[PDB]
Specification:
- Residues 9-113 form the Bromo domain.
- It is found in: Nucleus.
- This is Bromodomain adjacent to zinc finger domain protein 2B.
- Belongs to the WAL family.
- The chain is mainly alpha-helical and 115 residues long.
- It has a single domain, classed as Up-down Bundle (Histone Acetyltransferase, Chain A), CATH 1.20.920.
- Helix content is 57%, strand content 0%.
- The chain is built from 5 helices and no strands.
- α1 (14-26) packs antiparallel against α3 (56-64) and α4 (71-88) runs antiparallel to α5 (94-114).
- The longest helix is centred in the last third of the chain and has 21 residues, at 94-114.
- The radius of gyration is 16 Å and the shape is elongated.
């Protein structure tokens, strides 16, 4: 509350560390469905079904322009990529498996880096 604060966690490396995690995600061999925005002209259904499209390049641009207030908002956009993938793709599909793999990958790096 007012004038009563928990001890001050150091957040000054968070930007760099989130950038590193993103680089590791960008360069994974299963990243290919998530590197660029889905082409909303050429993919039927996507515009209507996926209310909040997200992809790594868009995450990269937001990161680099100071559009993430904190590391929790960054984790939400990353997760949103995989939740979107689950919504639109069958589990038994190259793209569906890519999403489950990439989620696992991210979640481990995140815990190892911050928890």
């Amino acid at each position: 509350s007012m004038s009563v604060k928990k001890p001050k966690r150091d957040d000054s490396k968070d930007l760099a560390l989130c950038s590193m995690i993103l680089t590791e995600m960008e360069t994974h061999e299963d990243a290919w469905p998530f590197l660029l925005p889905v082409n909303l002209k050429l993919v039927p259904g996507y515009k209507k079904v996926i209310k909040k499209p997200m992809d790594f390049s868009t995450i990269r641009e937001k990161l680099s322009s100071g559009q993430y207030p904190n590391l929790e908002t960054f984790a939400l956009d990353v997760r949103l990529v995989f939740d979107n993938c689950e919504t639109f793709n069958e589990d038994d599909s190259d793209i569906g498996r890519a999403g489950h793999n990439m989620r696992k990958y991210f979640e481990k790096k995140w815990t190892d880096t911050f928890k």
